[PDB]
Design an enzyme around this catalytic site. Structure first.
Site, PDB file in Angstrom:
ATOM      1  N   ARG A 147      96.155  73.578  43.063  1.00 14.81           N
ATOM      2  CA  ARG A 147      95.069  73.904  44.002  1.00 14.81           C
ATOM      3  C   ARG A 147      95.537  74.427  45.359  1.00 14.81           C
ATOM      4  O   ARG A 147      94.892  75.280  45.960  1.00 14.81           O
ATOM      5  CB  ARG A 147      94.170  72.689  44.237  1.00 14.81           C
ATOM      6  CG  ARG A 147      94.942  71.411  44.472  1.00 14.81           C
ATOM      7  CD  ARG A 147      94.107  70.339  45.144  1.00 14.81           C
ATOM      8  NE  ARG A 147      94.093  70.527  46.581  1.00 14.81           N
ATOM      9  CZ  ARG A 147      94.538  69.647  47.470  1.00 14.81           C
ATOM     10  NH1 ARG A 147      95.036  68.477  47.098  1.00 14.81           N
ATOM     11  NH2 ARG A 147      94.551  69.989  48.735  1.00 14.81           N
ATOM     12  N   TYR A 193      98.966  60.466  41.377  1.00 18.26           N
ATOM     13  CA  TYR A 193      99.550  60.934  40.113  1.00 18.26           C
ATOM     14  C   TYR A 193      99.943  59.903  39.045  1.00 18.26           C
ATOM     15  O   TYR A 193      99.389  59.897  37.947  1.00 18.26           O
ATOM     16  CB  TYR A 193     100.780  61.795  40.400  1.00 18.26           C
ATOM     17  CG  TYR A 193     100.551  62.942  41.355  1.00 18.26           C
ATOM     18  CD1 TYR A 193      99.830  64.076  40.968  1.00 18.26           C
ATOM     19  CD2 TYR A 193     101.100  62.918  42.637  1.00 18.26           C
ATOM     20  CE1 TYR A 193      99.668  65.155  41.830  1.00 18.26           C
ATOM     21  CE2 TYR A 193     100.942  63.995  43.506  1.00 18.26           C
ATOM     22  CZ  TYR A 193     100.226  65.105  43.097  1.00 18.26           C
ATOM     23  OH  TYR A 193     100.059  66.152  43.972  1.00 18.26           O
ATOM     24  N   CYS A 245      97.810  67.840  44.506  1.00 16.96           N
ATOM     25  CA  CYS A 245      98.060  69.268  44.715  1.00 16.96           C
ATOM     26  C   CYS A 245      98.183  69.901  43.339  1.00 16.96           C
ATOM     27  O   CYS A 245      97.521  70.897  43.047  1.00 16.96           O
ATOM     28  CB  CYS A 245      99.328  69.479  45.540  1.00 16.96           C
ATOM     29  SG  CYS A 245      99.084  69.210  47.323  1.00 16.96           S
ATOM     30  N   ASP A 253     102.415  75.363  49.296  1.00 14.62           N
ATOM     31  CA  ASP A 253     103.246  75.795  50.410  1.00 14.62           C
ATOM     32  C   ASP A 253     104.369  76.493  49.646  1.00 14.62           C
ATOM     33  O   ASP A 253     105.199  75.841  49.011  1.00 14.62           O
ATOM     34  CB  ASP A 253     103.784  74.584  51.174  1.00 14.62           C
ATOM     35  CG  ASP A 253     104.690  74.969  52.339  1.00 14.62           C
ATOM     36  OD1 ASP A 253     105.253  76.087  52.342  1.00 14.62           O
ATOM     37  OD2 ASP A 253     104.850  74.132  53.257  1.00 14.62           O
ATOM     38  N   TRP A 282     107.983  60.442  50.013  1.00 14.58           N
ATOM     39  CA  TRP A 282     106.604  59.961  50.056  1.00 14.58           C
ATOM     40  C   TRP A 282     106.318  58.980  51.181  1.00 14.58           C
ATOM     41  O   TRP A 282     105.195  58.472  51.291  1.00 14.58           O
ATOM     42  CB  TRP A 282     106.209  59.325  48.721  1.00 14.58           C
ATOM     43  CG  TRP A 282     105.855  60.301  47.641  1.00 14.58           C
ATOM     44  CD1 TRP A 282     106.678  60.769  46.664  1.00 14.58           C
ATOM     45  CD2 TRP A 282     104.573  60.898  47.411  1.00 14.58           C
ATOM     46  NE1 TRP A 282     105.992  61.615  45.837  1.00 14.58           N
ATOM     47  CE2 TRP A 282     104.698  61.717  46.272  1.00 14.58           C
ATOM     48  CE3 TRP A 282     103.332  60.816  48.054  1.00 14.58           C
ATOM     49  CZ2 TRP A 282     103.622  62.458  45.753  1.00 14.58           C
ATOM     50  CZ3 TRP A 282     102.259  61.550  47.543  1.00 14.58           C
ATOM     51  CH2 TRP A 282     102.414  62.360  46.402  1.00 14.58           C
ATOM     52  N   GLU A 290     111.409  61.284  41.503  1.00 18.10           N
ATOM     53  CA  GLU A 290     109.958  61.287  41.651  1.00 18.10           C
ATOM     54  C   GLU A 290     109.237  61.403  40.296  1.00 18.10           C
ATOM     55  O   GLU A 290     108.243  60.721  40.059  1.00 18.10           O
ATOM     56  CB  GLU A 290     109.522  62.419  42.581  1.00 18.10           C
ATOM     57  CG  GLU A 290     108.018  62.485  42.793  1.00 18.10           C
ATOM     58  CD  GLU A 290     107.562  63.782  43.428  1.00 18.10           C
ATOM     59  OE1 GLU A 290     107.902  64.865  42.917  1.00 18.10           O
ATOM     60  OE2 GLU A 290     106.845  63.724  44.439  1.00 18.10           O
TER      61      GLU A 290
END
Lengths: 264, 264
Positions: free
Chosen positions: B166, B94, B146, B169, B80, B58
């Protein structure tokens, strides 16, 4: 105040010698976080008297999307003169990014009205953010944003806010910047019928200028005094309707102000 | 690892009940900061076995400015899929913001090449930042970033990095996100002839999903094991030249992996 005094001592105790843009050396630490419960009183440093009038005037100037020095001048506020050009223009700084973020396709985004909508319509959202770090307009700004990114959070009818500060002058800048955002949380909260929560301050390069050592040692000697109480005498129709007179700070008994010069 | 386990216990101990987007309740705390000294070993959670192969794939995908699922698919990486459309497009997420931030006047900004330049030419800079929070392209992204903002810092020949997350989990996302950025600091450092410093993690809404309580309690029972060592077997010509084979993690002896389902 306690958290502030702890930061100063920490920079002294573990900061590395780091020079800034062609000049003064500094003691620097990277990454730091402080928390202020706004319910415990307004976070205005008491170990050194600070003046709120320039802060209030500057905030109200940010909210109007103003990027020119004129409004501050009408009020004899001169904290941005250093950066303005002969026209009083600063470039697309804070005010411009907050109220009119330019998009590739010609729109201008009102980030603060967006936030207000989210706080009233979707309070549990994890995206209630306003950013002044517009990469495409960085070259045009008088200076890149120091307080570049901030997020709001609602829980138990309480509005909290976290600020990311990329660079911070602990002695001169920080006290001014904590109060400015604390004041903004109160305005936001009043407008959304929410209680004030926490103001979390997060910094990157947090430093003390070498030529501020006498002053920091002087301040580090003082014992913090009870935090004052912020009172808004009015409830404007919108967040863009506040007036300098609306704010009053009660119970502020600070130690004498300290001056810190700067190299040029 | 210790810092991670402290966070989990904290969310349990003081998190408020907060529901997410039309669904599962969560325990949430706002504003938290952890520090990992990358010199002490690679921060990969040992109290639960984690697989690095999807992370590496990734990251390398982010660096290529890729915003389509194709590359991940060729490698059977499917993290994804959930968000991609029938074409495998995720929108300007991103990869796109890091390598080609669109400006109002038609330019595309390579933020990571900019950063590399700053780390080599002006290491004391307080502006070495990359942001994926492009307000004007938010509506087009499969999901808002995120991990939206990160800053680099150089001191004593050591490269540190602070990430602003921001939303987080803690059980499912965080372990994956700490490793991903830690790995990125190593690559950045190798490319700039710098030693690795700290990785400071800063989060906003940090939460645990209610339907993850059994798993967190299971993990909280385990004793952390020594951190592994990250080894790069090669030194590519540029940061865009790394290959999946270049990385090797040594000395990783984790407790058994734990699974945590999600509502839909």
């Amino acid at each position: 105040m306690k958290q502030y005094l702890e930061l100063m001592q920490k920079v002294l105790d573990e900061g590395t010698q780091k020079n800034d843009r062609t000049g003064t050396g500094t003691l620097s630490i990277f990454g730091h976080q402080m928390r202020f419960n706004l319910q415990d009183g307004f976070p205005l440093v008491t170990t050194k008297r600070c003046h709120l009038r320039s802060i209030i005037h500057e905030l109200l100037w940010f909210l109007q999307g103003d990027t020119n020095i004129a409004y501050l001048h009408e009020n004899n506020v001169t904290i941005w003169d250093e950066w303005a050009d002969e026209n009083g223009d600063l470039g697309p700084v804070y005010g411009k990014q907050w109220r009119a973020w330019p998009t590739p396709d010609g729109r201008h985004i009102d980030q603060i009205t967006t936030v207000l909508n989210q706080l009233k319509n979707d309070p549990d959202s994890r995206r209630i953010i306003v950013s002044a770090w517009n990469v495409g307009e960085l070259d045009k700004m008088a200076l890149a944003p120091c307080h570049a990114f901030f997020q709001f959070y609602v829980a138990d009818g309480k509005l909290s806010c976290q600020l990311y500060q990329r660079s911070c002058d602990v002695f001169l800048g920080l006290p001014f910047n904590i109060a400015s955002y604390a004041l903004l949380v109160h305005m936001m909260a009043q407008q959304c019928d929410l209680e004030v929560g926490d103001f979390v301050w997060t910094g990157g390069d947090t430093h003390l200028y070498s030529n501020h050592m006498d002053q920091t040692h002087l301040q580090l000697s003082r014992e913090p005094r009870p935090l004052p109480k912020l009172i808004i005498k009015r409830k404007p129709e919108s967040i863009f309707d506040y007036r300098f007179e609306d704010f009053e700070i009660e119970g502020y008994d600070p130690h004498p102000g300290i001056k810190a010069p700067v190299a040029i």
